Design a protein around this ligand. Structure first.
Ligand SMILES: [Mg+2]
Ligand SMILES: [Mg+2]
Ligand SMILES: [Mg+2]
Ligand SMILES: [Mg+2]
Ligand SMILES: [Mg+2]
Ligand SMILES: [Mg+2]
Ligand SMILES: [Mg+2]
Ligand SMILES: [Mg+2]
Ligand SMILES: [Mg+2]
Ligand SMILES: [Mg+2]
Ligand SMILES: [Mg+2]
Ligand SMILES: [Mg+2]
Ligand SMILES: [Mg+2]
Ligand SMILES: [Mg+2]
Ligand SMILES: [Mg+2]
Ligand SMILES: [Mg+2]
Ligand SMILES: [Mg+2]
Ligand SMILES: [Mg+2]
Ligand SMILES: [Mg+2]
Ligand SMILES: [Mg+2]
Ligand SMILES: [Mg+2]
Ligand SMILES: [Mg+2]
Ligand SMILES: [Mg+2]
Ligand SMILES: [Mg+2]
Ligand SMILES: [Mg+2]
Ligand SMILES: [Mg+2]
Ligand SMILES: [Mg+2]
Ligand SMILES: [Mg+2]
Ligand SMILES: [Mg+2]
Ligand SMILES: [Mg+2]
Ligand SMILES: [Mg+2]
Ligand SMILES: [Mg+2]
Lengths: 154, 136, 143, 61, 88, 386
RNA sequence: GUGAACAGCCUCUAGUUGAUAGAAUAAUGUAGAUAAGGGAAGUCGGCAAAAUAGAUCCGUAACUUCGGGAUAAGGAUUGGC
RNA sequence: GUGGAUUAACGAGAUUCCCACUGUCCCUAUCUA
RNA sequence: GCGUUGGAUUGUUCACCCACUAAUAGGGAACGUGAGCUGGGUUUAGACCGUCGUGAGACAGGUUAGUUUUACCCUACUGAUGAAUGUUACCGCAAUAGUAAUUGAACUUAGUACGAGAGGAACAGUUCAUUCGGAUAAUUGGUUUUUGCGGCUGUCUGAUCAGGCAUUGCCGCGAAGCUACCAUCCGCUGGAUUAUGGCUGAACGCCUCUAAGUCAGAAUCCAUGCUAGAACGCGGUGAUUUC
């Protein structure tokens, strides 16, 4: 029993989910879902479709190369059996996932660094234009004060 | 009755009714095979006999060598192109319908099979497995 | 789907793949094997006049000449440019077999890339030399 | 006169399954009930003790 | 060939039923009954914990019940309405 | 003249008439035969159908082609909270059949069974069993006289149980009552067991266990009025034939000059009561395990509730039965689970199932993550998360 | 306006908004549609539907009353800037 | 007993095959008014 | 009890061929189903050829083209309500009627028994499939007025934006619902017998399965099980008014 990766769309494939196409070279393409599979059949580009991990890595929205990503390989030469080694692997998996999520959040917080300065600049330009729309606001606030206070006077 | 097949065959989706053209996948000299009957099929009013991957059929040769034509021969279906289910769970399909020429005892007439072979056919027929280099 | 994509992209109407054509365009011996085809009764130009990028057979040689001038061919040539998107890219995008994919990428930018480009250059000048003073009618004589 | 009429729940009060809501007939019968109430009031009777004792519908040309 | 109601098939199935299948049924029965006894015991201990938290022959002549006492008090409508199985 | 082309008949004539059922709760028409030396056991249970999922089991079946292999199978989950015992009924064998002669109830009934006895509960004065509750006062003796009568007469003993509908995510508020036959030994010990178990609950672990084959009795999903083509499975007439083609062409001959009872007309489809036998129990899960959706090949802390709830049902939060395959009726309907009516002599009823994986992705859509932590770890950080 | 076009489709001036209504969404219809794998195995009969289709360029057989057949057959294309 | 015998083009004329294409069919399902 | 096919072909059918198959048995029901539906006839009028007739015309000689068009009624059948037996509610019994599963392979027995050889079984123990049936929707596929999200052409709203119209404009994806051997699951065991094989034993001083009596034995019969529940068959149990 194995979890596979979607060929077109890079999502996990669990047992009983999706479809597989066997090409004439014994190359097997497993598909996440009918959306990823039909995009394959219509021959669309996965590096061009924006909702895929291939696009996100190639465009630099996600971190692509890291020491935490050098751990899951296809292991073709097996080791015998060792209860202690299995327990160490099961601990190291959780530690590795924790480190990887921390580094991914750090990558996002670095690439989203200018979204306070840009917002202040557009807000100050909008406020610096249209002065007489700010006098309607000044009249509206003073009308909200006096009408409520004489209603609170009652 | 079921001659040459080692063991039993479980249920697989049938893809090829009587009257279909499939490719010839060995080097015997034929190009395509026209399906005229299916060995070991049931009887029902109005229902066509249909073959699936790993079945012995009776076929004729339409394109290919001039010696092979105008005669009826047994064949075995090795690639299906209609999606069936593996019991370790995934649905899967090939690119084309294809079979090889055989005698009634299950032995093969050619010497090598081109392209992949379904593992259900290769597990059901031992002489198909000995003549194929790619099994799914 | 509806009707159009069902009519075009049906499994019995499938066309060849980009990474198979990329492996065809590498290895100059494979280019000579694809240019020097035998006679075939079921191909349009009796197996001759074949475009390697758009993996289709032409009727005449003047048809191949106008196809090479056209705009569909330029779309396929622009598609067959960089790293050809195998399953290794999907695996490494998921975070799996990443060192193997990195070896593959640096290998294709070191060795196989300029070889493919030099074969494509030689093939373009050879086809432009051959398809220059060709008549429009064809001798049906297949020799 | 109820051949091929629909069924409804509101017949359960009277023990039948087929019942309707004839609007025009209800308006006409209400007009005659109001006229009879006005006639008994002009004669000077107790309105709380009146009951419908005879009613008859007959065909016209 | 053989039907579901074939005698030789049913005899061979009878011998098989007397063996290891009946042994497995008996073992599963004993395990289920032990589970049921433990269930009742844990419930009665929970009720005892709630309680220690807070603080000759039985003869027969006539039943009780609403419709039964109604039919008893009636006792005549059948032989008055000329009906009632076993009596005229 | 003869037909000249034989064909089998369209449809089964032992499932007639194809009419609506008389209740939502399908009734049990047979119980396993009593063996007076075994201990006292209940022979059925009742629960609610809550959706399907997919598992992977490691198969051990000697002689098959899938011996020592992995196999994907569909399963059905039944939500089974405990049942609560409220009464006892005795039955006497008459030369016209069984006749019930005495019913005894418990001293403290509940609002759910009282809701079952009322049709307009919001207006009622809730007067039910108020005079019966006075029968347990100091001597009372009507209870003891009735139990002594069941001990003396009454060769068949059944227990009245009701469900715990407030422990489900349903809106019904109003419990179901049923009779369950006791098949232990000793009629006196049967009614002593019942009187000891008054006002108490029974779990499903005390009735069933894993690797057992059971039967399911339920009312199937309804479809309304249906034509003959889908109601019976007939062929279609060719195209543009006069007066339609989803029909049976000849419904009779000259003689007999009637339509016969076997000639496939239109009418009600679905909402029939059905009994299906030999369904294997794959998991008996507890409501407090906190990893009852996990295996020894999965090592993840998750329950059997899928990602987002069961569609049209909700969470589980109780004990559950996980059986192999399909079960009649739709989701959130009441199902009766019966023990096996005979000793099965197949190896399928004797194997020992080992689950390898249980699917818990979303069934409301195309789910491809099993846990929300797995979805968050695959997607990474979003715009609202920072 | 599009377009070869008094074709179809959308709009200005002018004119109309008439034709018993309300609520639901069973079966069977009438008028339309889509369908995996196969491709006439269906039927008296490819009935009906699908497929083709404008324009540019290349190319086009038997036969012939030499005028035709002929848009024979077959192929490469078509946006925006 | 030496109107008869051919005929390009044209035809809502009659008959038979091929390629393409398909819910005609295997074997039915679903949607709109 | 249960099954008995897919095609080809002469006007059509039988017969006859080609396969597959456990097998491709034979008949009846107005030669079942000419106002359930259809090709051809009954069934005319137009036209041509052959033969006959002086002629009008004829021919069941040949070839073409050719108008019947209920159901809303009663019953039958399929489903759906329902007054009345103090009222109202819940849990049950089962008279009667129906009934359902069917064929083929595979391992092992065993290369054994049997046989010069060539060849070559079966009972007990296990595993799959064909036809039929009842469900079901986790997954795969189909379907989309979710007009859910995106795009395309023409035109209109001054442009952007947001949209209208194009008889559901068109194209791609598409949940939910429905659905498919185009998907998945499930489909029992007691008694009495038939043909036969026997035991004891007369008729008939022998003998005999039969005469009295009796032991077994078919996919058979009746049950078990499964569906309905007599709306004029029944039981047990709860609560019984406030002017
Ligand atoms: Mg009506
Ligand atoms: Mg009507
Ligand atoms: Mg017997
Ligand atoms: Mg017959
Ligand atoms: Mg019974
Ligand atoms: Mg779903
Ligand atoms: Mg213009
Ligand atoms: Mg115009
Ligand atoms: Mg199709
Ligand atoms: Mg045909
Ligand atoms: Mg035909
Ligand atoms: Mg036919
Ligand atoms: Mg047509
Ligand atoms: Mg021509
Ligand atoms: Mg002349
Ligand atoms: Mg057959
Ligand atoms: Mg007829
Ligand atoms: Mg008729
Ligand atoms: Mg005539
Ligand atoms: Mg005509
Ligand atoms: Mg009966
Ligand atoms: Mg049957
Ligand atoms: Mg045996
Ligand atoms: Mg069905
Ligand atoms: Mg889908
Ligand atoms: Mg939109
Ligand atoms: Mg627009
Ligand atoms: Mg629109
Ligand atoms: Mg869907
Ligand atoms: Mg199916
Ligand atoms: Mg006997
Ligand atoms: Mg009744």
């Amino acid at each position: 029993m194995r979890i596979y990766q979607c060929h077109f769309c890079s999502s996990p494939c669990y047992p009983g989910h999706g479809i597989m196409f066997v090409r004439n070279d014994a190359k097997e393409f497993r598909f996440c879902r009918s959306k990823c599979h039909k995009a394959f059949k219509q021959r669309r580009n996965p590096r061009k479709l924006k909702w895929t991990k291939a696009f996100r890595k190639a465009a630099g929205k996600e971190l692509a190369v890291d020491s935490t990503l050098t751990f899951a390989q296809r292991r073709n030469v097996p080791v015998r059996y060792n209860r202690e080694l299995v327990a160490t692997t099961l601990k190291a998996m959780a530690r590795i996932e924790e480190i990887r999520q921390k580094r991914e959040r750090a990558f996002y917080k670095n690439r989203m660094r200018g979204n306070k300065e840009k917002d202040f600049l557009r807000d100050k330009k909008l406020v610096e234009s249209n002065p007489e729309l700010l006098r309607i606001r000044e009249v509206e606030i003073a009308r909200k004060l006096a009408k409520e206070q004489e209603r609170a006077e009652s | 009755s079921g001659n040459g097949a080692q063991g039993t065959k479980f249920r697989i989706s049938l893809g090829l009714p009587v009257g279909a053209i499939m490719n010839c996948a060995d080097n015997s000299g034929a190009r395509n095979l026209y399906i005229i009957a299916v060995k070991g099929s049931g009887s029902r009013l109005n229902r066509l006999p249909a073959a699936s991957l790993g079945d012995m059929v009776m076929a004729t040769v339409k394109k290919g060598k001039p010696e092979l034509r105008k005669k009826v021969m047994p064949a075995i279906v090795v690639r299906q192109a209609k999606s069936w289910r593996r019991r370790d769970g995934v649905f899967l399909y090939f690119e084309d319908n294809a079979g090889v020429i055989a005698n009634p005892k299950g032995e093969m007439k050619g010497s090598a099979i081109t392209g992949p072979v379904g593992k259900e056919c290769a597990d059901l027929w031992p002489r198909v497995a000995s003549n194929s280099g790619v099994v799914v | 789907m509806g009707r159009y994509s069902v009519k075009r992209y049906k499994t019995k109407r499938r066309t060849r793949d980009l990474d198979l054509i990329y492996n065809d365009l590498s290895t100059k011996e494979s280019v000579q094997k694809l240019l020097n085809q035998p006679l075939d009764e079921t191909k349009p130009g009796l197996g001759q006049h074949y475009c390697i990028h758009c993996a289709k057979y032409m009727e005449t040689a003047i048809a191949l000449k106008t196809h090479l001038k056209g705009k569909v061919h330029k779309r396929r040539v622009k598609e067959l440019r960089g790293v050809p998107y195998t399953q290794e890219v999907s695996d490494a995008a998921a975070g799996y077999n990443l060192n193997k994919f990195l070896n593959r990428v640096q290998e294709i930018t070191q060795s196989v890339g300029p070889e493919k480009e030099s074969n494509e250059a030689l093939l373009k000048e050879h086809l432009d030399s051959t398809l220059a003073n060709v008549k429009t009618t064809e001798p049906t004589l297949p020799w | 006169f109820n051949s091929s009429i629909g069924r409804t729940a509101q017949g359960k009060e009277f023990g039948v399954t087929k019942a309707r809501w004839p609007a025009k007939s209800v308006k006409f019968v209400q007009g005659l009930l109001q006229n009879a109430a006005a006639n008994a009031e002009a004669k000077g009777l107790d309105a709380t003790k009146l009951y419908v004792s005879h009613i008859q519908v007959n065909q016209a040309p | 060939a053989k039907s579901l109601r074939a005698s030789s098939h049913l005899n061979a199935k009878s011998v098989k039923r007397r063996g290891v299948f009946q042994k497995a049924v008996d073992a599963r029965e004993q395990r289920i009954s032990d589970k049921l006894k433990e269930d009742l015991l844990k419930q009665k201990l929970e009720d005892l914990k709630k309680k220690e938290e807070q603080g000759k022959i039985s003869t027969s002549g006539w039943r009780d019940g609403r419709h039964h006492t109604y039919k008893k008090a009636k006792l005549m409508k059948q032989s008055k309405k000329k009906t009632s199985f076993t009596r005229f | 003249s003869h037909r000249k082309y034989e064909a089998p008949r369209h449809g089964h004539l032992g499932f007639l008439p194809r009419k609506r059922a008389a209740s939502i709760r399908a009734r049990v028409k047979a119980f396993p035969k009593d063996d007076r030396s075994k201990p006292v056991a209940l022979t059925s249970f009742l629960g609610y159908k809550a959706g399907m999922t997919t598992i992977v089991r490691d198969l051990d079946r000697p002689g098959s082609k899938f011996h020592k292999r992995e196999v994907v199978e569909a399963v059905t989950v039944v939500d089974t909270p405990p049942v609560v015992v409220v009464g006892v009924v005795g039955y006497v064998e008459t030369p016209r059949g069984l006749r019930s002669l005495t019913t005894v109830w418990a001293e403290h009934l509940s609002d759910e069974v009282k809701r079952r006895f009322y049709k307009n509960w919001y207006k009622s004065k809730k007067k039910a069993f108020t005079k019966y509750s006075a029968k347990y006062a100091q001597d009372g003796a009507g209870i003891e006289r009735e139990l002594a009568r069941i001990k003396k007469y009454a060769s068949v003993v059944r227990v009245l149980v009701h469900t715990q509908i407030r422990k489900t995510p349903l809106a019904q508020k109003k419990a179901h009552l049923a009779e369950i036959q006791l098949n232990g030994g000793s009629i006196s010990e049967k009614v002593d067991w019942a009187r000891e178990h008054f006002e108490k609950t029974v779990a499903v672990d005390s009735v069933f266990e894993q690797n057992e084959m059971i039967d399911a009795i339920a009312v199937t999903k309804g479809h309304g009025f249906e034509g003959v083509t889908h109601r019976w499975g007939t062929k279609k007439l060719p195209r543009k034939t006069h007066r339609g083609l989803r029909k049976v062409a000849c419904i009779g001959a000259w003689h007999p000059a009637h339509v016969m009872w076997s000639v496939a007309r239109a009418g009600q489809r679905g909402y029939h009561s059905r009994t299906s036998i030999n369904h294997k129990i794959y998991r008996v899960g507890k409501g407090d395990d906190e990893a009852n959706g996990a295996t020894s090949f999965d090592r993840t802390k998750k329950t059997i509730t899928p990602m987002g709830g069961f569609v049209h049902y909700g969470e589980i939060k109780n004990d559950f039965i996980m059986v192999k395959g399909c079960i009649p009726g739709n989701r959130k309907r009441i199902v009766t689970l019966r023990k096996s009516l005979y000793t099965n002599t197949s190896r399928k009823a004797l194997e020992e199932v080992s689950l390898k994986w249980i699917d818990t992705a979303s069934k409301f859509g195309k789910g491809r993550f099993q846990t929300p932590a797995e979805k968050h770890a695959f997607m990474g950080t979003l715009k609202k998360d920072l």
